[PDB]
Structure 1
Amino acid sequence: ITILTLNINGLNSAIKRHRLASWIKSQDPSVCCIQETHLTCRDTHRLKIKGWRKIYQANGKQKKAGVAILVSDKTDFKPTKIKRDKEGHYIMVKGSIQQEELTILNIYAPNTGAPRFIKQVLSDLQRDLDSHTLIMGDFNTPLSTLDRSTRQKVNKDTQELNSALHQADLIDIYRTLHPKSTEYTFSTANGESKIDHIVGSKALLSKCKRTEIITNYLSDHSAIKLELR
């Protein structure tokens, strides 16, 4: 299967929804984690993509944040649990694909206090984390020195997040498969950073076949795609 993460930078326009649908069809992911749909909980019906009927969403009441997990019609996904943030910053979906269990946590961290935010979500969802977990999305933080063009060491709050990840036997899959990578998923006029991530259970590393970053015209973030046995 293929799993794809993208911060879409809003889906309140028909044109954005159309171009996203075309891009998804082309990429043909089994499961797609989207951040920043900007859809209100009253507007979630607006997200429909032919070929991806099962769409699980977490949304607040304003046109900000918002996350979705889309599952391909060709994927026989059998859900077992879905947990939605009432504020629209994360959604967890658990289930199986051909008798292989998978836990996916789609996260959009705020641009201030991100590593603290992510650490708190991990704590809140501690009982549902497992040895077949993927945590993906826009963490709004580096995880290691090479995740920023500046090469600054990550701060204390980020170190604390990394320790919490380590205690859960979670690793940065991208950086594990590509240790020397100086790729990025976000930029500004003066620098670049890899703030979008695929984190997962140590036990899933054996199933992780390939991962890559995908630049695109849709958003101010590049996507990350993972192929999983």
Structure 2
Amino acid sequence: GSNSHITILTLNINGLNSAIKRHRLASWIKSQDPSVCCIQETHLTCRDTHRLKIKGWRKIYQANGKQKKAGVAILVSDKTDFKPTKIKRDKEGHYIMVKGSIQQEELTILNIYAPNTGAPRFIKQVLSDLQRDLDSHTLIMGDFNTPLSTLDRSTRQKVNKDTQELNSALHQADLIDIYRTLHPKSTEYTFFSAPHHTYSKIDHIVGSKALLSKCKRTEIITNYLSDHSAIKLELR
């Protein structure tokens, strides 16, 4: 039935330098119809950001480096009135935060692409740097390049000390893994590693514990676009 929920989607797209990949992405976004879309690994340089244009999604905020490497973007649908108050872009293109409100209701979105190496330490550092901005209306999403619990890997291997430290930091900031909270017994994955034939959930949606009761539904979406599956959160 008709309602005022928003949907926030996160996808690591694995590059957007070829025109067709941009149209395939535009088609997929059009079909998913997210209020807000967090994309990682655009691989667009700070010179080439204007290449990313998606009909229906005219408001776009990007953080990019100088190389065809990393690159993150937050796209807001034309049907969504997100009045921003603050946009903080990583100079190296690994995260972007936008803060603002929809419907008089405040919302802080942090889109992160952690490096393959040192990911859990990287994410903890970003949280600390942004501590004053990450309030009780926060969603953090993206490709953390790490599991957060044992169920996030097919190996069932315990998570390392740096990941344990990351989880402590999340808890100190009143943040929780929304997907794992809604689906505690889930053994779904977003990424397949062919070298070891293993599967992992390295893409996450984390948020303020205060937003828990607003989190209606969250799901993983397989796709032909990328080597990562998307995740979608429906928020009251």
Rounded Cα–Cα distance in structure 2 between residues aligned with 1:192 and 1:161: 26
Residues 129-164 of structure 1 deviation map (CA, whole Å, 9 limit, x = unaligned): 100000000000000000000001100000000000
Which consecutive residues of structure 2, in runs of 5 or more, have no partner in the other structure?
1-5
What is the match of residue 2 of structure 1? 7
Structure-2 separation of matches of 1:222 and 1:143: 17
**Mapped contact 1:55–1:69 kept (Cα < 8 A):** yes
Deviations 1:4-34, CA, capped at 9 Å, x for gaps: 0000000000010000000000000000000
CA distance in 1, matches of 2:125, 2:141: 16
User: How much does 1:189 deviate?
Assistant: 2.3
Q: Distance in 2 between matches of 1:116 and 1:227?
A: 29
Spell out, residue by residue over 1:94-115, the C-alpha distance to the aligned partner (whole angstroms, 9 max, x if none).
Answer: 0101111100000000000000
- CA gap of 1:88–1:167, structure 2 versus 1, over 3 A, is same
Deviation sequence 1:149-205 (CA, Å, 0-9, x none) = 000110000000000000000000000000000000000225577000000000000
User: Distance in 2 between the 1:29 and 1:129 partners?
Assistant: 23
Aligned partner (choices 201, 206, 228) of residue 221 of structure 1:
228
CA RMSD of superposed structures (Å): 0.9
Q: TM-score, normalised by structure 1?
A: 0.99
Q: 1-side partners of 2:157 and 2:97: how far apart?
A: 31
Name the structure 2 match of 1:101: 106
1:192 to 1:73, Cα distance in 2 relative to 1, 3 A: farther
**Aligned residue pairs, count:** 229
The 1-side partners of 2:55 and 2:100 are apart by 22
**2:23: which partner in 1?**
18
Tell me if structure 2 keeps the 8 A contact 1:149–1:191. Answer: no
Per-residue CA shift, 1:33-83, capped at 9, x if unaligned?
000000000000000000000000000000000000000000011111000
Contact 1:6 1:222 (8 Å CA) reproduced: yes
Q: Any gaps of 5 or more consecutive residues in structure 1?
A: none
Q: Is the 8 A contact 1:84 1:90 kept in 2?
A: yes
Identify the residue that residue 65 of structure 1 maps to in structure 2: 70
Q: SS at the partner of 1:161?
A: helix
**1:12 touches 1:39 (CA, 8 Å); kept in 2?**
yes
Distance verdict in 2 for CA 1:113–1:76, change over 3 Å: same
- Percent of matched pairs sharing the same residue: 97
Is the Cα contact below 8 Å between 1:184 and 1:192 reproduced in 2? no
Aligned to 1:36: 41
Aligned equivalents of 2:9 and 2:195: distance in 1?
A: 28
Distance 1:45 1:139, change over 3 A: same
What is the distance in 1 between the residues matched to 2:196 and 2:89?
33
SS in 2 for 1:38: coil
Moved more, 159-168 or 186-195: 186-195
TM-score, with length taken from structure 2? 0.96
Residues 1:170 and 1:208: Cα distance change in structure 2 (over 3 Å): same
SS in 2 for 1:127: coil
1:56-135 matched pairs, under 5 angstroms: 56-135=61-140
